[PDB]
């Protein structure tokens, strides 16, 4: 027979997408088969179902019986979902073992309680980390930091403000914090750690994590792991090479009504071409909310006349655009993003320079990698701390698209894109890491 791997993902497109791309990359050039075994505390989203049902026939999926959590933070909820699913998980993995050559279970950072059924059944427990090597190093370091505590010195990383540490540790009194410590202390139970990053992006963190140390699991750098819109592409086709700022704000959080108003003026005043994926703002004044034609229309909250005045150089679309296809298009010269790691890696693989717009603490850590460390990104003044003024938005858009700063960032991003292409080549570090994992799983047969 041939090897079978179970993968236990978190809820949320952000965790599922890179695990799905890992699974696709493994079965593409290996005769392996995979089951996604999905713990749930409620119905999965249609976007989550869309990813699962679109995978190749070598990759199936099973939902575990829903846990009733009736009684806030998503990490506490994930942790309780997995802990209350362990009986179901053991019986499911046993049933999989009777139809397939199950050799391993791969879990996320908040899935360490699922190690118990894996170890019980004699299959290898592995961790898959879909975010940065910097976040992995911070996760591993949390037990030490907890016993210690002015800038936070994450091993291998550029120093980081306490106020920037990923959101599950931003309140120590919270259950989410005690769960991060619980999972961090269990990390060495893993036979290996699969990291969604590559050396030229995070040399410091990966060098640290890959330092051979007795009783610490090996870390496999497998990144970058990345992947109806015809009218959007037809628009892009009609713009000159390198001219369009893609404002990819369809995911990664919500702007305030105030911030959305400043962003519309700042884009218009730049006179640059843009493709803006808009979601409904929050923080909406009563007078606005009750006066728009449709509450569901994100475009209804834009300034009076903005869409009419910009219609020659700006395409504004509701909620979605084909992000990978846009970033591949020669007309795309910039990418403004909330700096989800998946979004950053897409922009890197296509060589599109970034404007960093982080809203959440983990996005702020990601934005430090691209702005301050590898410098393939510019950031508007104040972003993540305060409303960004229209003049600050105009300034950063001009800097990226026409300025000397833009030219430098664009050259550095081209060199990083070439390093990413090398990493995923036949003889590249990510391909070698996937082959290494394949050989580990085959040896368990």
Automatic annotation (TrEMBL):
Pfam families: UDPGT (PF00201). Its EC number is 2.4.1.-. SUPFAM superfamilies: UDP-Glycosyltransferase/glycogen phosphorylase. Keywords: Glycosyltransferase, Transferase. It is an enzyme of class 2 (transferase). GO terms for molecular function: UDP-glycosyltransferase activity. Belongs to the UDP-glycosyltransferase family. This is Glycosyltransferase. It comes from Rhodiola rosea. The lineage of its organism: Eukaryota, Viridiplantae, Streptophyta, Embryophyta, Tracheophyta.
